């Protein structure tokens, strides 16, 4: 199967990649934010939205990878192999979760279409060279 | 956060664990089944159901976990740890995906309440010793 | 005192012993089943039934013996003596708890009189030699 | 499961622990008292009350725990562990049965609410230092 | 700032010191009593009273000192320095918390003015030499 | 007991921790501010508000913690432990008092709901990278 997790939400993997990697917050900071803003609704027994259902699975999969790292470190008593697995996750998969977490959190706070219009505006703005581009970047509040 | 991926779908992790792990199909067989029955709807740009949204994220995360296992199998220096980490990924996180994939596929084909009634009936049936239990097990339809 | 825990529930220790010991599920499997079917009612602040009150005390006494084993193993640092205490419990008292747990769980799911009629029917059936006895045994279901 | 044997009887483990352990009678003395006051009803084929059902299971489990202690005292090879395991059974699980036996006997003789009001009054009284506390302690009526 | 924690409650540090230190229960016993009598209201989301607000901060500060002791003992692996910090707390600050805990608990159970009248009566009584003073001391109730 | 000092005031420990620790003023500066703005009311014999009662206990407990730190700095024999225990008191328990002092001062000057709305807005703002976030941060007034 060729599945795009953004496709049912009016976006695509390409559109998210349009933003530079450095622009996304850390996974840690996005999880703290998900809690801060939406802990009650995430843990609730209501399908509040597709964004909520998407966020739940993503948070639990990141959860599984962190349980694996801890398990390797303490249960296998092998911190070296632990450090390699953390390094592999952060290098190879961290960006994907950063994009996905940011996208679904941003979509809930600011609204879906606002986040889309913001991806195009910011990518244009950032690519425009410093001299040419307006000093005040596009904002979502 | 304490999130339960089954909680928004009227179930829980405990209820799913009530079925013995050996009685779930393989991940490979569930993915082929997901395709066989629902490839068009999974790949579509419509939020067909929370089951569809849940399945999409799970199917995509499994890809990443299998790339991790392969990577560990080639790249992990310590022979003691390596085979254990591959085994843990394939079987221990494998069981979670087997439960989740089976649950969401079963819920779409046969209906949510049918799947729930079936979990309780089968767990009781399987635990009942051979002599005591009916010869014909409970059937999903 | 000569107390029979089955006497207030229309049965006796003799009637329960009428079933072969091999016929009962494991303690572990009966506790998982008690949870699966009745966790909410067991933990509730209502005397739902004498079966519930009986189950609560039995589950907690098994609980106490398992806390003792763990305590011997980890707190006294003596796994050898741990293994002897587990072995003593499983050979000497496990059958009693298996009979009692099965009885009170079976009485709640299928109804008290049904379970009684089933004890007599099954004991007769199992004692009748293989050649002579019907192929389909009595079923509680 | 998190089961509280006092919860269905309007109390909790915390409330019972509010009384110092030294102020409960011996298990032996509570069993003799249970007999003295209620032998006929305990041994009867009627569910006289939840207190009666609770008492029956507790009295029967104490028998098993005392057979375990005796067995450990003769059969446990390791002298360090043996005396500690006997001591743990007699005193540490002994306190639980002392609390539970006293509670259910006291509830039958004096009434449930009277026993509850008495737990709070006595715990306050005993903790208040000799100088500060009234000479007449609370009495069970 | 010169702040008196008793001043807003119609008392002072001097008036509390009027009672001998030996008269107060242990911190441990007052915390168990605070729980026993008021766990629900202390943990609740209502400002039940200034006594409740005062008690919450005091219980949490004692909590912080006990987390420090544990941290020194286990995390710094230094039980010696642990023993010195516990000794310093118990000799230097324990009386203050004993006075404050007793005061706010006593004020809630027996009423504020009753506790005040009781401080003066008891201090007079205790200072009156044994021969001269009534045999029955003043009682809180 | 699980007590939250913010729970009575419509907030929680999690919500306060949402702000980075570095963005709170020093304890010294918050105490000078508490004096500057509210010395008369804090030292007064009126329960002006729950915020005032909370502040009084916290300000008095900080005194005791600073006497402990000084005492450890002169009197703790083990050089390894001593600097770590002073550092832990000043920074780690310091953060708790910084959060609590700031919270209760901010609640009195600007109003409770304003402070809450400000915690969420600022945490979001600070976590969102410079490029994404508005140049003007949220302001307390
Ligand atoms: C765990 C489990 C799984 C199934 C499925 C196994 C294979 C696919 C369809 C049913 N069943 O029938 C069980 O009883 C228990
Ligand atoms: C918990 C408890 C129990 C008793 C009973 C022990 C024997 C039966 C009557 C009292 N007393 O006297 C207490 O103070 C406290
Ligand atoms: C953690 C923290 C603290 C403050 C206060 C710092 C100074 C006192 C008033 C606000 N602010 O403004 C933040 O954004 C974050």
Author numbering:
A (entry chain A), B (entry chain B), C (entry chain E), D (entry chain F), E (entry chain C), F (entry chain D): 1 to 141
Question: Paper's wording?
Answer:
In order to understand the interaction between HBV core protein and ciclopirox at the molecular level, we purified and crystallized Cp149-Y132A in the presence of ciclopirox. A 2.3-Å resolution dataset was collected, and was subsequently refined to Rwork of 25.8% and Rfree of 30.4%, with good geometry. As in the structures of Cp149-Y132A complexed with other assembly modulators, the complex with ciclopirox consisted of an asymmetric unit made up of a closed trimer of CD dimers, positioned in a similar fashion around the icosahedral threefold axis of the wild-type HBV capsid. The crystal structure of HBV core protein complexed with ciclopirox shows that ciclopirox occupies only three of six possible binding sites in the hydrophobic pocket at the dimeric interface of HBV core protein due to movement of the F23 residue and proline-rich loop 6. The binding pocket was formed by hydrophobic residues L19, F23, F24, P25, Y118, F122, and W102, with extensive van der Waals interactions between ciclopirox and these residues. Y118 in particular played a key role in securing the ciclopirox, by forming strong hydrogen bonds and salt bridges with a carbonyl oxygen, a nitrogen, and a hydroxyl group of the pyridine ring of ciclopirox. When the hydrophobic pocket to which ciclopirox binds was compared to the hydrophobic pocket at the dimer-dimer interfaces to which ciclopirox does not bind, it became clear why the latter pocket cannot bind to ciclopirox despite the fact that the two pockets have very similar shapes and share many of the same residues. First, the absence of binding of ciclopirox causes F23 to rotate by 142 degrees and to place its phenyl ring into the pocket. In this conformation, the phenyl ring of F23 directly collides with the pyridine ring of ciclopirox, thereby disallowing ciclopirox to bind to the pocket. The second reason why ciclopirox does not bind to the non-binding pocket is that the proline-rich loop (loop 6, residues 128–134) surrounding the dimer-dimer interface moves ~2 Å into the binding pocket when ciclopirox is absent; if ciclopirox enters the non-binding pocket, its pyridine ring may clash sterically with P129 of the loop.
